């Protein structure tokens, strides 16, 4: 028993991290097969970031201008191309530590592990959720760009995020591995509105099921609700509307605990309307939304 | 910016994990050089765990009874010995993935990463603190025994914990890598009192400094206090007494932010006496104590 904000083991991803330098800028790259992926803003200087013309900036660059180093060994760059906001540097050597991998675009509300890196070296790993507004609340300092987010299913790493920037509000924005930003964000040093965020309702319910499985039950009540009634409360408290697809994904947790999804919704409704009254759930004094129903089942079953 | 409960990258530890089977029991082992370390309770059966005679149980076992498998390859056991509550199985092959390592006994209040494993396979990584009462609030299910805790300083892994059991209260107990339990715990299936736990005051203060560095400042007030006055409040709220050694370790964070340690103590005093009033600090609605002053500096500076 016990419940933790668990990240995937980062080993398979550590073996892919490289340092990429272009001029005076150094950031992180991901070396998979004979390609290194990194944010295209590695080609920018301070004067450029306000509104860089990436096509023009990249034209002044040659294969030899991109310095790629994997630990202490230098990789030979034989090609370069820009795909959306990522640069793909073709190298003459396939990464011998390349795991089985996929590039996936995750949905808002889904979770993933981030391996924060500096100068191509891993510093730490933490579990994140892609906010409904497509930002992530990470921990990234100068030099962290090119750090990636991923999920792991047995031996396959599904890369879903590459870190590009911190918005003036202190939240983080990045792209999928094809360089498409999550959300409306552009890779420019400008004020960018991130939409209204909401709490991931299906994840809070999954976390309430994790609480019951692990022994924290004080919040269970004698009430039930309907999807319509619950959604009126979800609206008032900036929670995502619950759909039948969300109820269906909560099926296994409802079956395991014997607590019907709408009964758990009624517990969540009471917690939203009355707060915690100074109590905690799974060591938290707020409603946790960065655990999906899949995460809860995985952690509660011990999937390796 | 941003602050997360970050774990160390687990790669160096994943390459050491093995499965150890003895009879019908399977758990995790740590393969370093030509030795595999695992909890000695791998030799027990259900009837034994109420009060096992480990010396007698181990005498009925031979090198060939310990099945050690690293992924898909079987290791040949050429020796076995019990040191405190750990078994050391000598194997004929040194682990080629053995990183630089140390065995350390951490102090209560210190933090470490845990790589939860099942059947010798890593499932996840999370950051823990050794509670003042020598328990850890982990996430471990059946089969997790032998999972380890560690810290990493550049290329050196300092192994500090090996998981042995879950107490009837749902908290976790384990040993250092020499098999000495942290706390009063014994490896028996019996009710075991874990002492009164307290909140790690120096860690809460370090986390308040992390909050100021990252922009959450609402809790800063116009007051100051003394170590004596603060400790009277710490006593009332089951917080560890603050010492000058704790103030000294907070020095770098006090210097970076310009907020004197006793002024931060006065903010903490007001938060203990008045609560959060429905606000959050670094995404938490409670006072966080699982970040040491070293962790805060490391995460705020980007040490890899
Ligand atoms: C506004 O900056 C940008 C806009 C578009 C593109 C790149 C930008 O930044 C490049 C350098 N940024 C960093 O190294 C970070 C510093 C702190 N926190 C982070 O998450 C990243
Ligand atoms: C009371 O059990 C023991 C006492 C002494 C020694 C060993 C004991 O357990 C062996 C198996 N335990 C597990 O696999 C766990 C199940 C669930 N949670 C965990 O943290 C471990």
Swiss-Prot record, chains A, B:
Control of this protein's activity: Inhibited by pyridone-containing alpha-ketoamides compounds 13a and 13b. In turn, alpha-ketoamide 13b (tert-butyl (1-((S)-1-(((S)-4-(benzylamino)-3,4-dioxo-1-((S)-2-oxopyrrolidin-3-yl)butan-2-yl)amino)-3-cyclopropyl-1-oxopropan-2-yl)-2-oxo-1,2-dihydropyridin-3-yl)carbamate) inhibits SARS-CoV-2 replication in human lung cells. Inhibited ex vivo by michael acceptor inhibitor N3. Inhibited ex vivo by compound 11a and 11b.
Effect of substituting residue 142 to A: Does not affect ability to cleave and inactivate human TRMT1
Catalytic residues (positions): 41, 145
Effect in UniProt of substituting residue 132 to H: In strain: Omicron/BA.1, Omicron/BA.2, Omicron/BA.2.12.1, Omicron/BA.2.75, Omicron/BA.4, Omicron/BA.5, Omicron/BQ.1.1, Omicron/XBB.1.5, Omicron/EG.5.1
Domain of life of the organism encoding this protein: Viruses
Catalytic activity: TSAVLQ-|-SGFRK-NH2 and SGVTFQ-|-GKFKK the two peptides corresponding to the two self-cleavage sites of the SARS 3C-like proteinase are the two most reactive peptide substrates. The enzyme exhibits a strong preference for substrates containing Gln at P1 position and Leu at P2 position
Topological domains, Cytoplasmic: 1-304
Every Peptidase C30 domain range: 1-304
Cell compartments where the protein resides: Host cytoplasm; Host Golgi apparatus; Host nucleus
Signal peptide: none
Glycyl lysine isopeptide (Lys-Gly) (interchain with G-Cter in ubiquitin) cross-link, chain position(s): 5, 90
The protein's assembly and partners: 3CL-PRO exists as monomer and homodimer. Only the homodimer shows catalytic activity. Interacts with host FBXO22; this interaction promotes the proteasomal degradation of nsp5.
Function description: Cleaves the C-terminus of replicase polyprotein at 11 sites. Recognizes substrates containing the core sequence [ILMVF]-Q-|-[SGACN]. Cleaves and inactivates human TRMT1, preventing tRNA guanine(26)-dimethylation of tRNAs. May cleave human NLRP1 in lung epithelial cells, thereby activating the NLRP1 inflammasome pathway. May cleave human GSDMD, triggering alternative GSDME-mediated epithelial cell death upon activation of the NLRP1 inflammasome, which may enhance the release interleukins 1B, 6, 16 and 18. Also able to bind an ADP-ribose-1''-phosphate (ADRP).
Protein name: 3C-like proteinase nsp5
Species of the source: Severe acute respiratory syndrome coronavirus 2 (2019-nCoV)
Phylogenetic lineage: Viruses, Riboviria, Orthornavirae, Pisuviricota, Pisoniviricetes
Gene: rep
């Amino acid at each position: 028993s016990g419940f933790r904000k668990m990240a995937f083991p980062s080993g398979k991803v550590e073996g892919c991290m490289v340092q990429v330098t272009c001029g005076t800028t150094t950031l992180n790259g991901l070396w998979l097969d004979d390609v290194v992926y990194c944010p295209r803003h590695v080609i920018c200087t301070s004067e450029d970031m306000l509104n860089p013309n990436y096509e023009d900036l990249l034209i002044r660059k040659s294969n030899h201008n991109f310095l790629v180093q994997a630990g202490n060994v230098q990789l030979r760059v034989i090609g370069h191309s820009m795909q959306n906001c990522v640069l793909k540097l073709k190298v003459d050597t396939a990464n011998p530590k390349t795991p089985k991998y996929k590039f996936v675009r995750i949905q808002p509300g889904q979770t993933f592990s981030v391996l924060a890196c500096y100068n191509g070296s891993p510093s730490g790993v933490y579990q994140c959720a892609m906010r409904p507004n497509f930002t992530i609340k990470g921990s990234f300092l100068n030099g962290s760009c090119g750090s990636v987010g991923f999920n792991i299913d047995y031996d396959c790493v599904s890369f879903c995020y590459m870190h590009h920037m911190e918005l003036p509000t202190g939240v983080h924005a990045g792209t999928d591995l094809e360089g498409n930003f999550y959300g409306p964000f552009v890779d420019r040093q400008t004020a960018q509105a991130a939409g209204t965020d909401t709490t991931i309702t299906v994840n809070v319910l999954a976390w309430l099921y994790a609480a019951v499985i692990n022994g924290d039950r004080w919040f269970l009540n004698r009430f039930t609700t309907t999807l319509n009634d619950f959604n009126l409360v979800a609206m008032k408290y900036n929670y995502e509307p619950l759909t039948q697809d969300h109820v269906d994904i909560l099926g296994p947790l409802s079956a395991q605990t014997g607590i019907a999804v709408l009964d758990m919704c009624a517990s969540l409704k009471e917690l939203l309307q009355n707060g915690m009254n100074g109590r905690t759930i799974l060591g938290s004094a707020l409603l946790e939304d960065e655990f999906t129903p899949f995460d809860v089942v995985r952690q509660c079953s011990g999937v390796t």
